[PDB]
Amino acid sequence: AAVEARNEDWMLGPLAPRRELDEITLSNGNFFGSLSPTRALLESEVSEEERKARVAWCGSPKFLCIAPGDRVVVIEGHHKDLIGTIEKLNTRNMTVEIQSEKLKTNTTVPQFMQNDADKPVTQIYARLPISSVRLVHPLKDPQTGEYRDVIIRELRPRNIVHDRPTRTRSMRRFVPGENIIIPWPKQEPIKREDQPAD
């Protein structure tokens, strides 16, 4: 459609149509310039071979060296070089949410979850795969002595130790080649409560 729209605008000029005011496309049900919730959230289940590729730069799907709270930088798409903080991380599809205003995109809301008075289209933060982002961490420059932000291209796990009684796991992450152990981000543990039925 973008191939047909670019040509139409080039030929018509002052008669360029107002496509934003047209009806939805029945082939998919989306408005103009609007994505689908499945495509804006990337809720599609991918192959297990694809999951291993999305985190090839940050270890393995079961040994993941990126956590929510890390500042990453986009390296693909229109919003390249955009730096943001991770809010949530989905390990099923290996996607990540960066609540940045520039990453918002129009989305067609389905009607089974919308009142007759609400607007059909809305703007929501778009998810990205982990392969399209890289970690941004400040490292101390040894010769100058000042701290500047750098982009980490690769991460690997280190000092892995399991606890069979508790079925827990604690390890560290470092940058290969330079061997710089990067601390984990401050994560808040889930709040466990005692219910009356317990």
Partner 1 sequence: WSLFGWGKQKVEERNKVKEELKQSELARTAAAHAKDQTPTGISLKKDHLVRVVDPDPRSRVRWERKMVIRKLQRGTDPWSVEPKAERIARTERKLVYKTGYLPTSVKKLVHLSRQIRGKTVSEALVQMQFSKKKMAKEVKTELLRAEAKAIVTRGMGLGKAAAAAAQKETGAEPVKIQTKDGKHLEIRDPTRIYVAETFVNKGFTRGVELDYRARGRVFKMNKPTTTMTVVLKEEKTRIREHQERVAKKLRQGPWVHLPDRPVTSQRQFYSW
Partner 2 sequence: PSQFEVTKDRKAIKARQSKFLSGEETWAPGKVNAFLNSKI
Partner 3 sequence: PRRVTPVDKERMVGRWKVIQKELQKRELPVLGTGNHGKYVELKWLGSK
The entry of RNA, partner 1, Mg ion, none that residue 87 binds, CB within 5 to 8 Å by partner kind: none
Decide if 129 contacts 42 (C-beta within 8 A): yes
Decide if 76 contacts 70 (C-beta within 8 A): no
3-state helix, strand, coil in the chain (%, to 5): 20, 35, 45
Identity of the residue, 115 or 187, whose beta carbon is nearer to partner 2 in the bound complex: 115
Residues near RNA (CB under 7 A), total? 33
Q: Single out the residue of 56, 124, 54, 122 nearest to residue 89, CA to CA.
A: 54
Question: Of the ranges 20-28, 57-65, 67-75, 153-161, which one interacts with partner 2 (CB under 8 A)?
Answer: 20-28
Residue 39 within binding range of partner 3, rule CB under 8 A:
yes
Residue 28 within binding range of partner 1, rule CB under 8 A:
no
Query: CA–CA separation, 189 vs 166, rounded Å?
Result: 16
Q: Which residue from 42, 109, 124, 139 is in contact with partner 3, where contact means CB under 8 A?
A: 42
Residue 47 within binding range of partner 3, rule CB under 8 A:
yes
Residue 9 within binding range of partner 3, rule CB under 8 A:
no
CB of 154 to RNA, least distance (A): 11
For residue 16, give Cα distances in angstroms to 9, 24, 32, 35, 184.
5, 19, 15, 23, 53
Q: Which residue from 78, 148, 167, 186 is in contact with partner 1, where contact means CB under 8 A?
A: 78
Task: Give me the sheet containing 168-175, strands edge to edge.
Answer: 156-163, 168-175, 180-182
Residue 80 within binding range of partner 3, rule CB under 8 A:
yes
Residue 171 within binding range of RNA, rule CB under 7 A:
yes
* Stated length of the chain: 198
Give the footprint of partner 3 on this chain (CB under 8 A).
Answer: 39, 42, 44, 46-47, 50, 76-77, 80, 128-129, 132
